[PDB]
Structures are given as C-alpha cells and as structure tokens.
Amino acid sequence: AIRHANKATSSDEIVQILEEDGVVIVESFLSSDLVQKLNDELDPHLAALYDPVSGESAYHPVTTKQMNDLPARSQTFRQDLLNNTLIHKVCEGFYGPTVGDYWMSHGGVLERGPGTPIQSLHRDEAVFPAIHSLSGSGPPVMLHFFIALSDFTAENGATQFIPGSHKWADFNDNGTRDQAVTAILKAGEMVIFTGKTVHCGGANSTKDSVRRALGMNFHPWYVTPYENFYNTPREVVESMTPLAQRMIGWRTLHPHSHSFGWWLIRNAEAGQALGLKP
Amino acid sequence: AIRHANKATSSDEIVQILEEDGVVIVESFLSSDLVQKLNDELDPHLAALYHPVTTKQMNDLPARSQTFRQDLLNNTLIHKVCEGFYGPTVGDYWMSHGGVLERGPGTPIQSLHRDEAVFPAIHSLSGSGPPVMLHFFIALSDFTAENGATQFIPGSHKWADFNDNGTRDQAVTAILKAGEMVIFTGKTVHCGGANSTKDSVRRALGMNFHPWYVTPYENFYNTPREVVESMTPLAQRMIGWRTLHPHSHSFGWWLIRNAEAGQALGLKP
Numbered sequence: 001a002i003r004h005a006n007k008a009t010s011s012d013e014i015v016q017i018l019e020e021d022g023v024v025i026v027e028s029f030l031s032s033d034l035v036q037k038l039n040d041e042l043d044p045h046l047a048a049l050y051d052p053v054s055g056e057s058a059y060h061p062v063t064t065k066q067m068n069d070l071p072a073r074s075q076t077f078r079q080d081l082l083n084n085t086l087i088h089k090v091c092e093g094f095y096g097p098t099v100g101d102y103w104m105s106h107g108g109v110l111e112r113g114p115g116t117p118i119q120s121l122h123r124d125e126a127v128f129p130a131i132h133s134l135s136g137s138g139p140p141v142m143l144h145f146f147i148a149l150s151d152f153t154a155e156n157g158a159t160q161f162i163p164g165s166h167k168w169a170d171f172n173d174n175g176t177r178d179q180a181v182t183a184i185l186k187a188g189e190m191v192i193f194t195g196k197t198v199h200c201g202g203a204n205s206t207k208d209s210v211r212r213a214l215g216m217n218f219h220p221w222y223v224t225p226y227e228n229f230y231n232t233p234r235e236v237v238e239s240m241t242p243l244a245q246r247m248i249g250w251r252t253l254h255p256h257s258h259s260f261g262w263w264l265i266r267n268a269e270a271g272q273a274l275g276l277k278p
Numbered sequence: 279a280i281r282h283a284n285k286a287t288s289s290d291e292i293v294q295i296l297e298e299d300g301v302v303i304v305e306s307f308l309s310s311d312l313v314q315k316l317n318d319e320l321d322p323h324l325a326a327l328y329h330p331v332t333t334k335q336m337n338d339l340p341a342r343s344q345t346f347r348q349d350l351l352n353n354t355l356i357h358k359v360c361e362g363f364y365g366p367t368v369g370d371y372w373m374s375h376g377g378v379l380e381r382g383p384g385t386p387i388q389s390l391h392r393d394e395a396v397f398p399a400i401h402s403l404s405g406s407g408p409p410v411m412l413h414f415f416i417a418l419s420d421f422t423a424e425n426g427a428t429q430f431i432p433g434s435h436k437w438a439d440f441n442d443n444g445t446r447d448q449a450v451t452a453i454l455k456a457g458e459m460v461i462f463t464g465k466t467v468h469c470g471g472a473n474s475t476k477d478s479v480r481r482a483l484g485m486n487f488h489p490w491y492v493t494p495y496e497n498f499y500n501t502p503r504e505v506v507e508s509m510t511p512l513a514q515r516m517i518g519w520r521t522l523h524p525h526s527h528s529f530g531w532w533l534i535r536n537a538e539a540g541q542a543l544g545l546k547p
C-alpha cells in the first residue's frame with residue numbers, strides 16, 4: 001500500500017505523497033552502475049572494520065555492521081549522492097517556506113545478515129523528546145532517504161512502514177504490526193520517509209542473504225547534526241561542491257527567518273574563514 | 279646514492295644490492311589497495327594508544343591487523359630477501375619486531391646510530407660481524423625530505439670500526455611514495471629526519487627480522503589463539519609459535535620436550 005509509481009513522476013508529487021502517507025518508494029533512483037560503484041568503494045572500508053578472526057575481543061556473532069563518516073570514505077557518496085537533484089528537490093519541498101535551509105545529520109551504510117532479529121515499531125524522531133511530544137502537529141525535522149544497495153525482500157527483512165502514522169495525534173502509539181506494509185526494493189529503488197513515520201526493520205530469516213542499505217538522514221538548519229565532519233581531510237572537502245560542503249557543515253546555513261545567516265564565524269561565511277574558496 | 283630496484287629486478291639482485299650497499303629501495307612493493315587496507319586496520323588502534331606528543335607507535339601487530347597477519351608476514355619477496363641475507367649457515371629466521379611508526383610536525387632530527395648497537399658483542403665486530411638484523415621499512419605514507427625521510431650512508435655496513443657513525447653530509451635521503459619499501463641492515467648508519475611541516479604525519483611499518491639464534495624483542499604468546507590458528511605455519515614461525523630448523527643444529531631449536539612447539543601447544547601439525 002506504498003505507492004512506488006516514481007519514474008516519470010515529478011518531485012512535487014513525491015513531496016505530496018510524503019505529506020499524505022509519510023513514505024514513498026522511488027524506482028530506478030540509482031543506476032545499476034552507480035550501485036556497483038558504491039558497493040565497490042564501500043566494501044574495503046567495511047571489511048577493514050570487521051575482522052572475522054577475533055580472540056573474543058568484543059564479540060563473535062556478527063549479524064550487523066554499519067558505517068558512517070561516508071564523505072571521507074566514498075567519492076561517489078561525496079559527489080553523486082550529496083549533489084543528487086532529486087534528494088535536494090524533495091528536501092526543499094519537504095522543509096518548505098518556514099525552514100529555508102537544511103544539512104545532513106547522518107550518512108550511513110547498514111548491513112544485517114542472516115539471523116537478524118526483527119525491530120520494534122518506532123519513530124526515529126523519538127531521539128528529540130521536545131519535538132516528539134508534539135506528535136503529528138510537530139514541524140518537519142528528519143527526512144530519511146534509504147537507498148537499497150541490495151535486493152530488499154520480505155524474506156531478508158524488508159523494512160515495514162505504517163502509512164499515515166506521521167499525522168497521528170499521539171506518538172506514544174506506535175501502532176501495531178498488522179498495520180505495517182513491507183517495502184520491497186530491488187536495485188537502487190530508494191524509499192523516503194519522515195522521522196514521524198512508524199517503521200521497523202525486518203528479520204533476516206534467510207540463512208544466506210545480507211540486507212544492505214545507505215541511509216541519508218537530513219535535518220533543518222536549526223537541529224544539530226549527529227555527525228561531525230571536521231576530521232574530514234581538507235583536500236576531500238575542497239574537492240566537494242559548496243552545496244555538498246554545506247550538507248556536511250563546512251558552510252553557513254541561510255534560514256530565511258534569520259536572513260543574514262546561521263552557523264557563521266564572526267558573522268561571516270564559515271568555510272571561507274577556514275580556507276575554502278568563496 | 280641508494281638504488282631503486284623493482285618490477286623486473288629479481289630478489290636475488292635486491293639481495294646483491296643489500297650486500298653491496300647495505301640499503302636498497304623496492305619500488306611500489308605494496309599495491310595502493312594494500313596500503314589502504316593497512317591504514318584502515320591500523321587507524322583505530324593508533325587513535326586508542328592511551329603537552330602534545332609528536333612521536334607515536336604501535337606493535338604487537340599480528341594481534342591487531344589481518345593484512346599484517348596474512349599478506350605481510352607471508353610476502354614472498356621479504357622471504358626471498360631473508361633467505362638470501364642470512365644464507366646457507368643460518369637456515370632459519372624469525373621476526374623480532376613489527377611496528378607502526380608515526381612522526382608528525384615537531385619531530386626532531388635523529389642521530390646517526392646503527393641499530394645493531396643494542397648487541398655489544400656483535401656490534402664490537404664492526405663490518406666483519408655476522409648478519410643479524412634485517413629491516414623492511416614499508417611506507418604507509420609519503421616519505422619526503424620535507425616531512426623527515428630517513429637518511430642512510432651507503433657502504434657503512436662494511437666499515438672496520440663501528441665507533442665511527444659518519445657525518446651528516448655522507449647521508450643520502452630515502453625518498454619513498456606510499457607502498458614503497460626500503461630494506462637495510464642493522465650495521466648500516468641511518469637517522470630519521472625532522473618533520474618541519476606543520477600539518478603532515480609521516481607513517482611507516484617496520485619489520486625487523488633476526489636469525490634463529492638471536493632473541494626476538496617482541497613476545498607474541500599473549501596473542502589470542504584464534505588469530506594464531508588463522509595464520510599460515512610460516513607466519514606462525516615468524517612470531518615464535520613454531521620451532522626453528524637451523525642448518526647448524528638440524529634437529530631443531532626452540533622445542534618443547536624435543537618436539538615441535540606449536541604442535542605441543544595445541545596447534546595443528
């Protein structure tokens with residue numbers, strides 16, 4: 001009951017489906033070559049965090065991996081995803097008039113292989129109780145772009161959603177499990193959802209298949225990003241476009257409310273104060 | 279100067295350069311992907327290592343890095359060079375020390391020193407001494423004269439009096455890209471450079487090998503058994519978990535009850 005219908009569809013209708021249902025499925029979002037390039041850049045970094053041989057150390061049953069600080073690690077994430085026209089058109093439409101500017105809070109590759117337990121139904125914006133307590137009347141905060149780096153089946157745990165749960169008057173009700181619809185995704189096939197939408201990841205019943213995803217969680221300008229990107233090497237930041245630099249917090253935000261800017265250095269543009277080109 | 283040699287140069291020729299000069303440079307000995315795997319595996323444990331300090335280390339690598347456990351400890355070129363360096367009378371060898379070295383801005387220049395100085399009985403024999411230390415110095419980052427690339431004095435390994443450490447103008451800098459290696463003897467005069475640059479850390483991976491009869495500096499018995507059992511028997515011998523087979527005492531050395539030690543401690547034959 002999640003409408004995909006997102007190839008010839010305009011983004012304004014994508015924003016409309018996001019407003020009505022709280023979740024939308026974008027078909028054919030990433031080219032299969034883009035998925036292969038992303039998986040190739042991402043594999044070494046993941047393999048180097050998780051050594052299969054371990055002398056107990058932390059622990060052996062590894063049903064789950066995930067990784068962030070993507071801009072330092074992946075060029076294709078650095079350029080293609082952070083500058084993607086559809087992500088930004090949907091971001092501008094979702095935040096709308098009163099917000100104005102936005103930046104990325106969290107960019108992560110998530111992997112759950114065989115034996116992964118099913119998740120509880122929840123809302124990510126529960127991490128901000130002052131916003132969460134307003135329930136469905138609250139302002140837009142989190143926007144989540146979930147790219148499928150592998151097939152997304154009900155059998156390896158396709159993520160489930162409850163459409164319309166972003167409008168509920170009481171967010172202490174996370175709904176029930178018979179209200180959840182699974183999101184089947186094949187190649188790039190992104191799914192977009194709000195931080196107010198009830199959802200849960202599925203169980204990986206398979207003995208053999210690993211679910212892999214790339215989550216891009218965006219914030220309005222006034223909400224603190226989860227990730228700090230200042231240890232990113234300066235040459236990597238200087239290779240990025242100013243839009244992508246603003247996404248990772250190296251440029252000032254421009255809310256229309258406070259038109260003169262936010263996240264400034266001596267009331268001046270920040271990245272320019274620390275060596276980036278104007 | 280120092281002689282670069284790789285690609286079509288066979289390890290027999292690198293051993294010959296090592297005998298004549300005491301130092302040699304193997305170009306692009308590690309692939310950039312291998313350097314990337316090494317830096318990724320080493321960065322988290324370098325960050326957790328404990329006035330800002332400019333000198334930084336790590337050892338007990340086999341417990342810490344898979345790429346060192348498998349690729350580096352089993353590298354064919356290093357073992358060919360080891361067999362050629364110790365030669366017939368020795369027979370067997372093992373690694374004494376495996377370390378990551380990090381020196382960034384503010385690193386003072388080092389004195390010319392000859393590492394085998396830690397062994398007065400061998401060091402007193404000067405250039406007539408037996409081969410003891412073999413140092414494989416892999417570049418995990420660029421080595422520039424700007425960031426303090428190590429300097430060497432070619433031929434200083436065969437001098438008749440090791441109380442003479444030479445002087446600074448006899449030293450040749452070893453310029454390396456990431457992944458390039460420099461091999462040198464424990465009898466060769468050398469010194470690290472000063473890193474004047476305010477923004478750049480120089481990082482290296484040194485593997486110091488010994489003949490079978492010289493005690494390794496590193497003790498690897500606290501290494502968890504699961505990583506040791508994941509290693510090849512050659513790599514296990516490199517870290518002291520298997521007995522050596524010197525040509526001198528062919529029955530074996532470093533045994534448990536006159537039997538092979540690794541089998542004696544629960545390892546597979």
Ligand SMILES: [Fe+3]
Nearest residue numbers: 122123124199
């Ligand atoms: Fe969630």
Ligand SMILES: [Fe+3]
Nearest residue numbers: 391392393468
């Ligand atoms: Fe030295």
